[PDB]
Amino acid sequence: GTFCNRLEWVYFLTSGLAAAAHAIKFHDLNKLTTGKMLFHVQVPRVASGAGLPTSRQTTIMVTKYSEKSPITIPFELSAACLTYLRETFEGTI
Amino acid sequence: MENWSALELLPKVGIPTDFLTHVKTSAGEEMFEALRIYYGDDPERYNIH
Amino acid sequence: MENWSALELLPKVGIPTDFLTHVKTSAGEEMFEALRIYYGDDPERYNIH
Amino acid sequence: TVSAPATYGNFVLSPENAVTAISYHSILADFNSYKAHLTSGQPHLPNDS
Amino acid sequence: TVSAPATYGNFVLSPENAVTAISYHSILADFNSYKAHLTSGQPHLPNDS
Amino acid sequence: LSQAGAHSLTPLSMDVIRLGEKTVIMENLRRVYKNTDTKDPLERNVDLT
Q1: Which residues in chain E are contacts of C49 at CB distance < 8 A?
Q2: How big is the CA angle at B49 (ends E16 and D43), to the nearest 5 degrees?
């Protein structure tokens, strides 16, 4: 019995979808709850005409948020592979 | 709930904002989550405790 | 209700804390304002938000 | 053929960010830059964190 | 005769504390010593703020 | 009136088009009514009975 060991390796940065993202590696995300991104924007007025009700300065303070997403994969090991890796045995070939 | 004073006191960055629709419409139709829209000059950003 | 994990993980000033009565007596008979007594070893100090 | 970022976006935490993380359960990114530009006088940073 | 303090000592805000006063509505006194002994690992401050 | 002022000259790049060897300036006033409170008067309402 034999095996097969050809895999088409793909990478997140080599793929074209990395143009959609701005990949950031930050090692302590597990302590993070929510990441906000608060913005402040004031509007430009326009000078009013004669007798019109006029505007005034209006500032707007909004706040974006982050989204958590956990991904995973399980994988297993046989016990004979474990006792082969933890210690070598002499003997025949 | 949200410390809006820290937005008005801390130094920001300068970005070219490009909202999709008009910004007062996006404010009044509640696309964003938390809003602090007002008019005039609030002195709220001064009484620091 | 304060963050007692912040008291735990921050480095403290070593003081010869020597009040009059027993410690459990001065605690359980309410000498101080806000008490927090874990008897085992609480893992709430290890969760940072 | 386009130019692609060959590295991930490595991004570290400052020690006083760790102090704020312990004490107030919060993180202000690029705390040194905010602290400098506050006491300096300019209200516009170069860029975000 | 006794050696009395001639004037009142001054506790001053280090400019680290101004950012915490603005954002998180608190002052953690002696901020830089806490930062140094937190990044050093030594759990005992030499003295209190 | 033609004598009145308009002394110096400064360059600027705009978009122009040929209309039968009568060149005219293309221009849109979107960016001046970008996030304002008035109505752009180039938009209009026309009645048909």
Answers
A1: none
A2: 50
Q: In degrees rounded to 5, what are phi and psi of residue C12?
A: -110, 160
D44-45 and B12-13 beta bridge pairing: parallel
Residue A39: other Cβ atoms inside 10 A = 14
> Token pair for residue F12?
């600027």
Specify the experimental method.
cryo-EM
Could you tell me if E37 lies within 8 Å of chain C, comparing CB atoms? yes
Q: Is the CA virtual torsion D36, D38, D43, D45 positive or negative?
A: positive
Whole-angstrom distance, CA of residue C19 vs CA of residue B49: 34
Tell me how far apart the alpha carbons of residues A9 and C17 are, in angstroms, rounded to a whole number: 62
Nearest residue to F29 (alpha-carbon basis) of B14, B19, A46: A46
Residue A42 corresponds to which tokens in the numbers above?
Answer: 């004031």
| Alpha-carbon gap, residue D31 to D39, rounded angstroms | 12
By the 8 A CB rule, do A31 and C49 touch?
Answer: yes
Restricting to B residues 20-39, those with a Cβ less than 8 Å away from any Cβ of A are 23-24, 27, 32-39
Cβ–Cβ under 8 Å, residues D4 and A13: yes
Contact between residue B37 and residue B4 where contact means Cβ atoms under 8 Å apart:
no
Reported resolution, Å: 4.0
Residues of D in contact with A13 (CB under 8 A): 4-6, 8
Q: Which residues on adjacent β-strands are paired with residue A59?
A: A42, B38
Residue type, B22: H
Q: Which residues contact F29 (CB under 8 A, 6 or more apart)?
A: F40, F42
Option in D9, D21, D27 nearest A24 (CB): D9
CB interface of C with D, residues 3-22, below 8 Å: 3, 5-6, 9-10
Task: Tell how strand B12-13 and strand B38-39 pair up.
Answer: unpaired
**CA Rg, chain F, in Å?**
17
Q: In Å, what is the CA distance from C45 to each residue of A33, C7, C9, C42?
A: 16, 9, 7, 7
Side chain identity at residue A68, one-letter code: K
State both tokens at E4. 């009395």
